[PDB]
Chain A
Amino acid sequence: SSKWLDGFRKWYYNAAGFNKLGLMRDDTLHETEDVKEAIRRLPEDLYNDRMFRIKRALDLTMRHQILPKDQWTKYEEDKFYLEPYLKEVIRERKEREEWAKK
């Protein structure tokens, strides 16, 4: 039942509500030390786009509004830009931890 899981994933993505604020999935991650290091390694255009998206979301939440439905972040164009940087940061931190174990 792959398409049932996929359509349920689309439903959960629409029901989470951050697509109505223009946000991506990687903007909603909590900025811990690994996530902050992932933002620090970003290229500057992606960093500026992310900062504008957070500012727009905070401005929309201030007025208790949402974007119009055509401006919502669609599921197919939601790019997981922070995944390789976060993956590298987790790999390096686990390597440091396993070196500190021995």
Chain B
Amino acid sequence: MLSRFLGPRYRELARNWIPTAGMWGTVGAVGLVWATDWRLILDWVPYINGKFK
């Protein structure tokens, strides 16, 4: 990111890739919460919290 990414085409490419990156970060967040079985997120759910997990 020295000088060649300082351009409008690259900014509009990054703006195009914001929702895909955000959806993949959401996928990683939900997968991390489900896999590590975090209590601090799964206590505010309607259905999963009955097992306390």
Contacts and interface: CB of A to CB of B under 8 A. Distances in A.
Judged by CB atoms under 8 Å, the answer to whether A and B touch is yes
Interface of A: 97, 100-102
14 contacts: A97-B3, A97-B4, A100-B4, A100-B7, A100-B9, A101-B4, A101-B6, A101-B7, A101-B8, A101-B9, A101-B10, A102-B7, A102-B8, A102-B9
Contacts of B7: 100-102
Q: Which of B3, B4, B6, B9 has the most CB of A within 10 A?
A: B4
Contacts, number: 14
Interface residues of B, number: 7
A35 to B, nearest CB: 18
Nearest to B4: A97
Contacts of B3: 97
A99 to B, nearest CB: 10
Nearest to B10: A101
A72 to B, nearest CB: 38
Interface string B1-42: 001101111100000000000000000000000000000000
A102 B11 CA distance: 10
Q: Which of A97, A101, A102 has the most CB of B within 10 A?
A: A101
